[PDB]
Amino acid sequence: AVPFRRTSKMKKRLRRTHFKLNVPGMTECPSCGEMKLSHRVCKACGSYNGKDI
Amino acid sequence: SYRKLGRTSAQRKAMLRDLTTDLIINERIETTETRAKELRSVVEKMITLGKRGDLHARRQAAAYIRNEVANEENNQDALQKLFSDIATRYEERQGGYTRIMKLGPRRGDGAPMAIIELV
Amino acid sequence: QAKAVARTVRIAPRKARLVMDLIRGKQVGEAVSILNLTPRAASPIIEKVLKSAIANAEHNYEMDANNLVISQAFVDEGPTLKRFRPRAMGRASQINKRTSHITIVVSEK
Amino acid sequence: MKRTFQPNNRKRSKVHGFRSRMSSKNGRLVLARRRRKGRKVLSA
RNA sequence: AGAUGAUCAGGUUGAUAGGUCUGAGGUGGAAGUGUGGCGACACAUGGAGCUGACAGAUACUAAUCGAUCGAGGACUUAACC
RNA sequence: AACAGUGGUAGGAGAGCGUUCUAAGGGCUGUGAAGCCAGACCGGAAGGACUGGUGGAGCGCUUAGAAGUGAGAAUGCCGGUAUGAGUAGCGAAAGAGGGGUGAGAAUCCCCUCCACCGAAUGCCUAAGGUUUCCUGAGGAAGGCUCGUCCGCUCAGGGUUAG
RNA sequence: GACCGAUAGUGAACCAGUACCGUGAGGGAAAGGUGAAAAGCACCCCGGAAGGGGAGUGAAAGAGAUCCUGAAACCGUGUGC
RNA sequence: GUUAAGUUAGAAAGGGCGCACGGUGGAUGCCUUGGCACUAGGAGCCGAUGAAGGACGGGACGAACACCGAUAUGCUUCGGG
């Protein structure tokens, strides 16, 4: 229940390949321009689907 | 199916019940999205009861909702508000009494919050 | 070109590494959008230092903020802080409150 | 659980205390040892 | 369908999910009213009322607007040409 | 020159390399010492130079001498940093919403509901602790996260007996 | 002084028999270096701050408060094969 | 051109070797404010006229050090400067 050997740098990195972050699904705010998540609200425009809250 | 929300039956009922009352009062609230998804059904359901307006429905909805104020200067409660105001609002609509606009996540949870409305 | 540094900030470096491995080699505006929209602890720090970098460029070099690119961006493990968690049976476990030096370099096209 | 050290300043000062150490020869020798080392707190 | 990825059905000329209305099935005869009874209670209103996931409709709500990736197709020889 | 020989543990013998210091003599060094990093140089070995870079003041060479004189291993000592691995864990117990503050809020304050204790998780009070109390500022550390918050940090104040 | 030169040398070159441990006797550490001189960074920007980039001082700021040099382990960035 | 058959490049999610640049870390070199062992000389006891050792207090200014003792961060009175 313990490592029989110490893990090398190479395998450490090979494991940490997939350990990463994809970017968001991004879109502009057509109202005031800046970027935004898809299907979500522009925090700065305060707008969504051509409608302000 | 239906969700559990990391709670027991009793305390999720209490959650949803409080939230229904809070939404009836404020006509808009910010929560998590999943909680909103689970509200949407029961909330439109109580609105059906309001559209009925019968006393049987009054007593059902009273069994569900909580005894809070919804409008000072009127001594009004959530239940009276529900039936009178909201049924007078939605005589004509057949379901879909809500909107769920997704917001981004939260700082502490990373939890996707979202607002919910009465449309 | 231009530079900005955040030296000795209490955060683990690997996490910062992730967040800037996202944006290494991108336009500044979209990078700021990334950091604003991604839900991680390090994005505010990184957009802060980046914003400082572009400010340094515009103020001390006048390099047309919109026309900028992250030339390079990296993290360096800084001085840790040592702590101890009292685990069971009178034994303690060493805890490494890490620290990072964030560095960003900005140039033109 | 109950543990060994149950503090009572009276018991501490009446056992490990200055009057007590000065009462006995061997307690004086402590103070001698406990000075030429240089301990600030030479007794309770 | 599924630990997550994935897979599948759908993404506004659309029924993907919710809701609404019909139903199925389940529970068992609601609340209120009236009658009888001192009363507990019973009878009628009335196979009632209620109902989570079930299936059939329904464009009411949400699947928006976007964005990204993705080919230009090596050489030699043999046959047709 | 010729001839012959030159595997080697324990172990014996002999040749040397290198480090610190000292004596003497001869030197280098702000026009850049030692030390450190590179380099495709030299020597049979230990090893030794040269060039460049860093550094910014002490150091080699020769002959001798004297030694705390050479480290790869002691479940060695000390320190530092890794692996495991962004894994386990985040320490019993109902919270939700609206307002507010603030650079910044699941986590701080207020309100409303809901929920738990109730021979106890409530009131008094010992021993013990020794300023933790109150107020106002702060959020580097500690808080198993955050933090605008405190039993944390600063200031101040506060404990009245026939 | 053919004695040590900060893991050495007193345990202790620094507020040490301190902190800390222990009921107690008793045990018992770690931790030196800005610069010749504070001349210790006016002022401008980023930022809530911290921390940076400029400017300036200085022979030197890659000297900036763990402040001479600053190796290795370890951590990363880029790239020739 | 097509068809058939056969050859061979190139790839990089990421990784290895080398190189360059940095970080962390505190070795190494230089230095000494401290210590180690000795030599020569001196002196080898202090206390009820209250010891050694401490506690508590004293500064215009907080704590600590050091100094001092309600005459408290010095007071006479002889000298030096």
- Of the candidates C101, C105, C10, C8, the residue with the CA atom closest to the CA atom of residue C50: C105
Distance from CA of A6 to the nearest CA of C (A): 19
Pairing mode, if any, of strands A51-52 and A47-48?
antiparallel
Residue C36 touches partner A, C-beta closer than 8 Å: yes
Give the resolution in Å.
2.9
In angstroms, the CA C38 to CA A22 distance is: 9
On chain A, the residues whose CB falls within 8 A of the CB of C34 are 23-24, 26
The number of distinct structural domains making up chain C is 1
Encoded amino acid at A40, one letter: R
Distance from CA of C39 to the nearest CA of B (A): 6
DSSP, collapsed to helix, strand or coil, labels residue B2 as coil
Q: Find and give the residue nearest to F141, measured CA to C1'.
A: C81
Distance from CA of A16 to the nearest CA of B (A): 22
Domain with D31, as residue range(s), is 1-44
Within 10 angstroms of residue C93's Cβ, the number of other Cβ atoms is 10
Number of H helices, E strands in chain B: 5, 5
Domain with C75, as residue range(s), is 1-109
Q: Which nucleotides of E are covered by protein (CB under 7 A)?
A: 18-21, 30-32, 49-53, 58, 60-67
Contact (CB, 8 A) for B37 and B5: no
Q: Find and give the residue nearest to G52, measured CA to C1'.
A: C5
In angstroms, the CA B114 to CA B102 distance is: 4
Domain with A37, as residue range(s), is 2-53
Q: How many CA atoms lie within 13 A of C73 on its CB side?
A: 25
B94 touches strand E (CB under 7 A): yes
DSSP, collapsed to helix, strand or coil, labels residue C93 as strand
Domain with B90, as residue range(s), is 1-119
The number of distinct structural domains making up chain B is 1
In angstroms, the CA C57 to CA C76 distance is: 23
In chain C, the residue whose alpha carbon lies closest to the alpha carbon of A38 is C37
In chain B, the residue whose alpha carbon lies closest to the alpha carbon of A37 is B104
Experimental technique of record: cryo-EM
Contact (CB, 8 A) for B114 and B101: yes
The number of distinct structural domains making up chain D is 1
In angstroms, the CA C34 to CA C43 distance is: 8
Within 10 angstroms of residue C35's Cβ, the number of other Cβ atoms is 22
On chain A, the residues whose CB falls within 8 A of the CB of B115 are 53
In angstroms, the CA B3 to CA B47 distance is: 21
In angstroms, the CA C58 to CA C52 distance is: 10
**C21, C36, C40: residue with CB nearest A20:** C21
Report in angstroms the alpha-carbon separations of C78 from B1, B76, B109, C51.
Answer: 51, 61, 27, 22
